[PDB]
From Swiss-Prot:
Domain of life: Eukaryota
Domain comment in the entry: The BTB domain mediates homodimerization. Its dimer interface mediates peptide binding such as to corepressors BCOR and NCOR2. Interaction with corepressors through the BTB domain is needed to facilitate the rapid proliferation and survival of GC B-cells but is not involved in the T(FH) formation and BCL6-mediated suppression of T(H)2 and T(H)17 differentiationrequired for GC formation.
PTM field: Phosphorylated by ATM in response to genotoxic stress. Phosphorylation induces its degradation by ubiquitin/proteasome pathway.
Tissue note: Expressed in germinal center T- and B-cells and in primary immature dendritic cells.
Function field: Transcriptional repressor mainly required for germinal center (GC) formation and antibody affinity maturation which has different mechanisms of action specific to the lineage and biological functions. Forms complexes with different corepressors and histone deacetylases to repress the transcriptional expression of different subsets of target genes. Represses its target genes by binding directly to the DNA sequence 5'-TTCCTAGAA-3' (BCL6-binding site) or indirectly by repressing the transcriptional activity of transcription factors.
Entry's localization field: Nucleus
Organism whose genome encodes this protein: Homo sapiens
Disease per record: Chromosomal aberrations involving BCL6 are a cause of B-cell non-Hodgkin lymphomas (B-cell NHL), including diffuse large B-cell lymphoma and follicular lymphoma. Approximately 40% of diffuse large B-cell lymphomas and 5 to 10% of follicular lymphomas are associated with chromosomal translocations that deregulate expression of BCL6 by juxtaposing heterologous promoters to the BCL6 coding domain. Translocation t(3;14)(q27;q32). Translocation t(3;22)(q27;q11) with immunoglobulin gene regions. Translocation t(3;7)(q27;p12) with IKZF1 gene 5'non-coding region. A chromosomal aberration involving BCL6 may be a cause of a form of B-cell leukemia. Translocation t(3;11)(q27;q23) with POU2AF1/OBF1.
Induction: Down-regulated during maturation of dendritic cells by selective stimuli such as bacterial lipopolysaccharides (LPS), CD40LG and zymosan. Protein levels decreases upon genotoxic stress in a dose- and time-dependent way.
Name the UniProt record assigns to this protein: B-cell lymphoma 6 protein
Zn finger (C2H2-type) location: 11-34
Self-association state and partner proteins as the record states: Homodimer. Interacts (via BTB domain) with the corepressors BCOR, NCOR1 and SMRT/NCOR2; the interactions are direct. Forms preferably ternary complexes with BCOR and SMRT/NCOR2 on target gene promoters but, on enhancer elements, interacts with SMRT/NCOR2 and HDAC3 to repress proximal gene expression. Interacts with histone deacetylases HDAC2, HDAC5 and HDAC9 (via the catalytic domain). Interacts with ZBTB7 and BCL6B. Interacts with SCF(FBXO11) complex; the interaction is independent of phosphorylation and promotes ubiquitination.
Portion of the full sequence shown: 515 to 544 of 706
Length: 43
């Protein structure tokens, strides 16, 4: 798919499977859901 598409919604989490209408909405999820320090972070 190339630039130009009816209706926004082209942001899907890379780590997990999800969708977000806005970019800001996704970014947050990525952090909250997948905190920068979660994997090696025992807790
Ligand atoms: Zn995610």
């Amino acid at each position: 798919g190339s630039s130009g598409s009816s209706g926004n919604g082209a942001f899907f989490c890379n780590e997990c499977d999800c969708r977000f209408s806005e970019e800001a909405s996704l970014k947050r999820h990525t952090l909250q859901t997948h905190s920068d320090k979660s994997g090696p972070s025992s807790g």
